[PDB]
Amino acid sequence: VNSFSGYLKLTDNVYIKNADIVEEAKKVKPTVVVNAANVYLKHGGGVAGALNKATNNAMQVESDDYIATNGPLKVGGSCVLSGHNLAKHCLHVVGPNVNKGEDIQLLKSAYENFNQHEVLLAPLLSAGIFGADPIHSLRVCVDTVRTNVYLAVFDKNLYDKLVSSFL
């Protein structure tokens, strides 16, 4: 028994809620919140900018030090950094951005990172400003992640469409 509330059950291990991931993080303070990162960990907009703003830019400061030491992530890759005031840890995961020509087949590799964590609060990878088909992202999530994932999807029209079209 964990502290996530009002999530709707999709499968044995995947749950979904119509919510802003930052609001969920601040209320739950989960062990792991997933960021929809890019390879440079430049958190300007979308999930990354919303989370970073909620940390008062501390996420960006930590991320810049990480990149200066380690170089960029891979598309499909991830790193674990602090969750600051939102979570114990933030798992920064790079989904393919279809707006930059990045291979959609890398979405499965991106979701595989979630399997290294028993429970995660996460957004729908490559959705919204990343330009991928969201029904597709949810399908890949369900078929790839085996650990317990709590999805927060800001868009009500997206949330209703995702639930009502789910197979």
Ligand X SMILES: Cn1ncc2ncnc(NS(=O)(=O)Cc3ccc(CC#N)cc3)c21
Residue in the shown chain whose Cβ atom is closest to ligand X: 128
| CA-closest candidate to residue 96, choices 77, 115, 114, 79 | 77
| In the complex, minimum distance from the CB of residue 69 to ligand X, in angstroms, rounded to a whole number | 28
Nearer to ligand X, 20 or 62 (CB): 20
Q: How far apart are CA 112 and CA 129, in angstroms?
A: 21
CB of 74 to ligand X, least distance (A): 20
By beta-carbon proximity to ligand X, the closer residue of 76 and 95 is 95
Residues of this chain that bind ligand X (CB under 6 A):
20-22, 36, 46-47, 50, 123-124, 127-128, 152-155, 158
Residue 18 Cβ vs ligand X, minimum distance, rounded to whole Å: 9
Count CB atoms within 10 A of the CB of residue 32: 21
What does the H/E/C string look like for 26-94? HHHCCCEEEEEECCCCCCCCHHHHHHHHHCCCHHHHHHHHHHHHHCCCCCCCEEEEECCCCCCEEEEEE
Shortest reach from residue 47's CB to ligand X, in Å: 5
**Residue 98 neighbours by CB distance under 10 Å:** 15
- Residue closer to ligand X by CB (options 87, 127) is 127
Beta carbon nearer to ligand X, 65 or 113: 113
User: Least distance (Å) from ligand X to the CB of residue 77?
Assistant: 18
